[PDB]
Symmetry: D2
Subunit: 503 residues, 4 copies
């Protein structure tokens, strides 16, 4: 197509898409999905990485969930030999602010005045007149204006006055107020530590469990990630951290976060409460875009398929939301209550995979590729040059797939950055790298445990031919199709500087 | 350092802090039902931003809809307390269309029977299925099912919940096996995807409904299951001399309408993408493709396009919508959709006012997000030939408003077409369309950016004095509503002769 | 066309060009063209503005040339009955450096060969005795400006020297590149920032003479540090305030601060003659393609000059290289093209003007209007004033409707200039009461000036309609348009002088 | 550098270009350049291929020129261990129409006046006494091809006549523009498509002579259709099958069905000399900017020729218009530039080659690489052969990494031609064992041919690595690169299909 309008006009529902689905699917684990058999069915449906929500549950619960997911993935991983890698996600509880106790059932009427206090002797004595708040130095931040939310945005207050520990407020439309409810201070820069005590214990637990990825909540500044890396320490150094942008402060210096982060999640749930809801899409379409420029994964999450929790079929709005999320350039999509609490998890994962395939085919590869080429590269490192040239070759020759041999995974990450249509079959000896590769669009990880040959020359060829066999088994390619092969020289670090087209 | 070289750089440049303009260009369509039928609630919806009301004739009698029309007319006249300026509001008729339905389940036991996979079900001439219906027998009203269905084709029942595949074909009966089985209910629709049905676009009930709408003086009709252009020829002939001015909007609900979309869009006054039936017809995963195609083609043709069905569903039960619904409406308008529509949200839903309000807000934001320069260049480049003398005026006025960052463009029009041409090119500023004719101003709401203003003052003998008076009236409207203030530039388009399709003139004018 | 390469592939010799020729042709007047009858013939051929080179000739000579040009425009004015405007341009001698005189003995021009030494002495008492051992400068003490490693040129770049040693009054140099040195030849210093006065005494007298004669345009030579144009405006004074000044970029300094000059100037000429001597000749095209381009951004006229059709001085037909040069000059975006020795001294001036008009028409037709228009639209930033918005919208309307022409009603001429910036294919028929504005309108590409003598109508609306109809009549007589064609008309809202803001599409009767 | 206008605005004369000069320079050989010393100096100055015009001179003269060029290329090889490759080109006389002898005596040139009458006759018995009354031509089938108001030219397009009437054997004509008629003058019929055979008897003997001499390329004049090249290939036969043919587009018929010619030909030269006579001269640039462009789309070399630097024949310095012409010719996308009278008859051949190289470097640097590359990417079909995909990927990698050079190993030369099609800024060092392929590589922009004399090693990878390392050594000798610079190396199996980025050792 010549123009974007002509491209949109050229969309044909009759035009069939390719079988391969490049974008990863993230599923939150809960009572509905914790069972091993249900987990195997979800895994066969297309779940690439399972997400554990640490905002609730004990270490024993999540450890048992990890044990169940491991037994299920090993039982499914009985094809080929010891393949099928699957990534582990942590997601921290994060720095939240909570209300006190009145059980509750208090009612707050519009127009009346209530007082949110940090005095501890009101923790249990909460009522409609006065209320305790977890945040200690909320008075240090917050101005004479600034709206306040309680309970997922259901209740709203406006700060009228500020005293030592009172903050007299007026109710900007109110409902039923409970106990230990949400916070969300829109606009204000929160000073709370990025990693709290529970987050510290949870990160150490994740290091012990051997988790692949952490989703860090309320990532505001770049010092946060230094703290997270130093707390994960020497043992967890390989584990990748994905920052969650939930408030205005993280959004404001987003570029610094993306530079410091391994990836970003647009948590539309808390963000929609923080910033005006009507703007949320702007944010994601900004955020995703910037991520695609930086080469870091971006995840669209929260409330994508909500209605499927109760009902077997989704709404048109939800299919449109997921399709627009992947068309924006999102590396991965996420399910929260759909898989954890929902009654119809398999249908959720299935419809997500199918709609991802369709919107994935809908992309305008030539213009998007051209834009990603000029968006940032300079004289270029030389490593990215190999990736961009291989992507261009795969696009021009209409290759069935690209086979990438990598130790760290970086070469496959750059190739995924440049967005080829064909799958990226990344062959690696390291299990953890292959598992965490699912965070990037288009990377099909293949784990090669088979011994190495004395000479590196024939061993790399054996690994590439194993990738060929994988491609035919899955159905990516057949005899006579061309593919791109990227290798290097010497068995060391990032040296992927060979490109080949082979039929 | 510009306003984005590439589309990716444009998306990167979106800033939540950058405030949008007060004006909201895209129209909001609301379906009327028991929750919204009351006149007071209708006035509240109108004040919230409802531009056109939609009446679903698939249910209810003529007397009910006549009472609804009476209430909407009384309400729109009651709203006319803005300075004493009668506010125009459009009324739309959505046809029942040629549908195929099953009968009722017995009240015996639980409401709905369950149908499981592998079982038997007889398609017969069961006439007493309105109260004795069950799991054994099913009757259909489609006479010509035989010539139309093939072997491997699939059949759906009840909103896609149950799916069957036709095994064998006899004289009056189809034999099927249950592919996907669920809870068979009462009075459910039967839609077959792949296959094109030969049913007439306008049935007898549709004929009576269209004549009733013409008599009532409805502004627009939404025609369901529009397959070919002969449908629209028939609709024009049935509307006759009286309804000739009423605009027909074709609804693309099945694969047959999708296949020959260009002929329909050429023959139609506008198109609605009714994703309700469409998601059942073509695979649901593909529906967005259709809309993103359909809307796009409409924007090329200069005809209105409506994104509809299930936009704000969650708000029926709960006061606030989900992120997915806001994303759907925002992407619908960013695709280029002129109007958005609410079905159960306003008609059946519990929170209609909140639905209309949140729709207006998210519409404003996604409206501001657009990339005007590239989209304008594309819309300019789609028509390579020498452009029509009227369309040249429209495109030049849009370019002038874009370059001078005009607060608004004032259009004086009798038929309404010139404002439609200006709306095609998607200007950021509002399009203040001045018209003496009430119905043209009312139906102008189908186009993005047109604020209709109705001019009741009689025709002055001197044509130049009259056109200047109407342009000054548009200025007064803009100042009262708050579109513009003193010192802002605006574009004024008039004509060269006193009549109809003779538009012309472009002028940049400040404010006093 | 989608792309530039595909556009170049799409050029078709079968594709007929438009009748109109938008780009102006500048002709230098000399012994071959000074005669009144020959001058009328040149005007009929298509000469839009006449150029007078003040580097030679007296005030009386140029006044007589102006008299001949006026009588020629007078007798041409009975072709179709209306007064044909033609602009007269004054090109200043400028601050140039020349050598002294050779001893009349031997051959006229002594030869200087590479590797030998020669002494520049500045001392004025060595005016006749110059030879291969000693050389002489014209004016200004360049030793305060020149360093040792610097290079020096003599005679149109033919001879090159490098300063070996510097003394008080003198200068010892070695010949790097050697040629044939004559007497009183030009001297160009490529590296040094020149200290010469922007306006000299003779230049002052010449500008005052041009003001008295009522010249339309001045071409100011050797505009280096942009501060000059203030001096030029102050010397033109109250009488010349309306006269437009075109800066000539001939050396490295003018190229270095080109943006300040173009902002301060009314237009720019790329004088490739002196420029090719100053900067390396191989680079000249870069300069022009930069300079013209920036002018197109600014909305200022730009002139490509010097040695475009040189061979036609001697022979009746040009070479392929010269036709390519003029075609590429106009395709670059140059508003006007100029002939120097071709018309002044050359034997075949009329053929030069003819071939210039033809090749201008062809390269004019070859342009890619859509992409260039989009580029010029995206060059303009903020919510532009209503006048620029009207000009850009009118250009877009003329392009979309394939208008036969655009009729502009203007007093000062600015509105037609803004329309000319955006490069419409159709002619820009600018109707004006003021003769001088119509005359100087030829500096802009695509403007056909029309002078309206009647006017003084009681009703202002009827007067503007009469002037637009007179523009229609001009278009029909010349053949721009016929009944049934649409055209764009831009007028104003109130009787003023720089208001515009009206656009209409009207068909011809 | 967002837009083309902004690109032209951003051009800086101070911004230094790379030392490499990609576009080839063609020089016509004549009395001024035939000497061995002049030929060696031209070769060192930058002469890439020498052109022989067979419209004049005998077989002995051209054989002496070829002997001198071979002696010159061997004698130049004073670069420490560098065997210098050089291409030789043959330009055919072609099917031309000429008059007989005048009666010129007494004064040098007779004067013929405008408005007189002239009778063009095909009767052969009017030949010796021609002067001004009746004129004979050698084209037999003029009557079947010429129409009424068609025009006729005499003397290089300087003089013009119009055919008034037509009889059986003769035509009566009227003088529109009048000059002096000489002897053996060219006659071109513009409007008409000429039916003459592309290869005449003399053309046959000349092409076989060129095959015997071992010429690299032939320039075929007045190429109208593809049957011309069918005849040329059959005349080259088994021995000349490898020789590449460049078609000269001089008339309207070749322009009309240009696509078939460009597809069937190995390359095209836009001979602006005869073309300016055929089509209106004012239009010629259009043609070239089309022709060159289409060649760049097809991937075949295109040459802009004739009258580029004419003034340098008489004067030591060129005009601004001529420098602009050559710069615009290369900026259009012309693979090679050519000199006719500048080097053959002119007094200053070396100076012509010098200024040509300098202006070529400058206009080469001025190019907008990204947009031209993107256009060349989108012009090529959807599924593409693996070789062109390798070439486009190598060009994109060289552009992104700002490689110092690209090393290409090829036997036939095509892969390097595909890489040259996409126009990389860095030089394309093409290593080949066969001399003639290296010679004919000069027709393509950016290819520096390198001839590798070392014999076939038994191990394949060691042989390919030795050839690439010799290319590295060549780059260091010329001064293209230093340690730490990246370069592109394209190799393969057996058919090229390997592309790698390697830095400098």
């Amino acid at each position: 197509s010549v123009s974007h309008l002509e491209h949109m006009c050229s969309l044909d529902i009759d035009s069939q898409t390719a079988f391969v689905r490049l974008s990863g699917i993230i599923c939150t684990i809960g009572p509905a999905s914790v069972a091993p058999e249900m987990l195997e069915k979800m895994m066969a449906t297309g779940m690439n990485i399972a997400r554990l929500n640490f905002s609730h549950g004990s270490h024993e619960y999540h450890a048992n969930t990890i044990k169940n997911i491991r037994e299920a993935v090993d039982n499914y991983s009985k094809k080929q030999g010891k393949p099928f890698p699957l990534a582990i996600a942590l997601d921290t509880k994060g720095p939240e602010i909570r209300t006190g106790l009145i059980t509750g059932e208090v009612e707050l009427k519009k127009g009346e005045q209530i007082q949110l206090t940090t005095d501890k002797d009101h923790l249990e004595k909460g009522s409609k007149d006065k209320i305790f708040v977890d945040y200690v130095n909320i008075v240090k931040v917050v101005k004479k204006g600034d709206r306040v939310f309680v309970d997922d945005g259901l209740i709203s207050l406006v700060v009228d006055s500020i005293s030592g520990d009172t903050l007299t407020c007026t109710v900007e439309n109110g409902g039923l107020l409970g106990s230990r409810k949400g916070v969300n201070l829109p606009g204000v820069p929160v000073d709370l530590p990025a990693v709290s005590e529970k987050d510290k214990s949870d990160l150490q637990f994740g290091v012990e469990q051997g988790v692949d990825v952490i989703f860090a909540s309320f990532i505001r500044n770049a010092a946060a990630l230094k703290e997270i890396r130093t707390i994960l320490g020497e043992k967890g150094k390989n584990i990748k951290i994905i920052s969650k942008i939930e408030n205005q402060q993280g959004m404001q210096n987003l570029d610094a976060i993306i530079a410091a982060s391994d990836g970003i999640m647009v948590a539309r749930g808390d963000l929609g409460i923080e910033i005006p809801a009507e703007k949320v899409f702007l944010a994601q379409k900004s955020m995703i875009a910037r991520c695609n420029r930086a080469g870091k994964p971006v995840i669209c999450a929260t409330q994508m398929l909500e209605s499927m929790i109760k009902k077997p079929r989704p709404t048109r709005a939800e299919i449109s939301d997921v399709a627009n999320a992947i068309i924006d350039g999102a590396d991965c999509v996420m399910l929260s209550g759909e898989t954890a609490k929902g009654e119809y998890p398999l249908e959720c994962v299935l419809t997500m995979a199918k709609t991802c395939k369709e919107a994935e085919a809908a992309l305008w590869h030539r213009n998007l590729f051209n834009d990603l080429v000029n968006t940032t590269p300079t004289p270029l490192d030389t490593a990215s040059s190999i990736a961009i040239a291989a992507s261009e070759a795969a696009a021009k020759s209409r290759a069935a797939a690209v086979i990438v041999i990598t130790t760290s995974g970086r070469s496959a990450h750059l190739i995924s950055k440049y967005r080829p249509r064909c799958p990226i079959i990344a062959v690696t000896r390291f299990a953890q790298t292959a598992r965490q590769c699912h965070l990037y669009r288009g990377i099909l990880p293949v784990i090669y445990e088979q011994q190495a040959l004395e000479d590196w020359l024939k061993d790399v060829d054996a690994r590439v031919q194993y990738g060929m066999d994988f491609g035919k088994e899955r159905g990516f390619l057949k005899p006579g199709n061309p593919v791109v092969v990227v290798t290097g020289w010497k068995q060391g670090s990032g040296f992927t500087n060979t490109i080949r087209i082979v039929n």
